[PDB]
Amino acid sequence: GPSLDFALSLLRRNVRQVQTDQGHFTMLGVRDRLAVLPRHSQPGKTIWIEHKLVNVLDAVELVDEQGVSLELTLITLDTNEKFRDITKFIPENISTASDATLVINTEHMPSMFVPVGDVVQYGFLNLSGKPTHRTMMYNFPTKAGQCGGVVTSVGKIIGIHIGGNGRQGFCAGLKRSYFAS
Numbered sequence: 001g002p003s004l005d006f007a008l009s010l011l012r013r014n015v016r017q018v019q020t021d022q023g024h025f026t027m028l029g030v031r032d033r034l035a036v037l038p039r040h041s042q043p044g045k046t047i048w049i050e051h052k053l054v055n056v057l058d059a060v061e062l063v064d065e066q067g068v069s070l071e072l073t074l075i076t077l078d079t080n081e082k083f084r085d086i087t088k089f090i091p092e093n094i095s096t097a098s099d100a101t102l103v104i105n106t107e108h109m110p111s112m113f114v115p116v117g118d119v120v121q122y123g124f125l126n127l128s129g130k131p132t133h134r135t136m137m138y139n140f141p142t143k144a145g146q147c148g149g150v151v152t153s154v155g156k157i158i159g160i161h162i163g164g165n166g167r168q169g170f171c172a173g174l175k176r177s178y179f180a181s
């Protein structure tokens with residue numbers, strides 16, 4: 001229906017496969033030349049995007065007003081290509097959601113929808129030993145190589161995946177303000 005037809009729309013036009021030195025991830029193109037990666041993909045001065053080498057100009061890693069991790073990294077890629085601006089779909093606030101599907105697209109997991117069902121909010125979350133704020137939780141046994149994958153329910157973009165623990169998965173919650181500048 002609508003909910004996956006929007007996911008497709010997002011698949012074709014905004015979701016790219018990435019490889020950093022840390023592995024496979026799913027990149028979101030937000031607008032123009034701006035993208036988001038999960039902070040632990042750790043993009044350096046360069047990056048693979050569908051196997052072509054892309055140059056990485058800017059790169060910020062987002063934080064709490066308190067200065068905590070949000071495990072998210074805004075990158076500014078180096079092309080005449082323009083990302084179709086999907087910012088209007090990102091909520092004003094980090095919202096929970098009803099029946100979310102997870103759009104993932106890495107070399108290994110192309111065009112993959114994963115039905116995580118409800119996404120609820122969880123907040124502080126100490127995964128690796130690095131803590132993280134403003135995270136949300138779905139009840140789904142999320143696996144490696146999925147990190148960065150997009151969380152969409154009903155035509156909204158509320159999350160980039162980041163952690164898991166074998167039964168649940170956790171996303172980095174988004175709010176529009178992030179992609180202000």
Ligand SMILES: Cc1cc(C(=O)N[C@@H](Cc2ccc(F)cc2)C(=O)N[C@H](C=O)C[C@@H]2CCCNC2=O)no1
Binds near residue numbers: 144145147
């Ligand atoms: C047990 C245990 C699990 C994790 C864990 O989640 N680490 C994250 C990486 C991370 C490090 C620091 C940080 F601040 C935030 C995230 C991870 O590995 N993220 C993956 C994407 O690359 C996806 C995960 C992998 C685990 C299974 N489910 C998947 O969803 N740590 O200890």
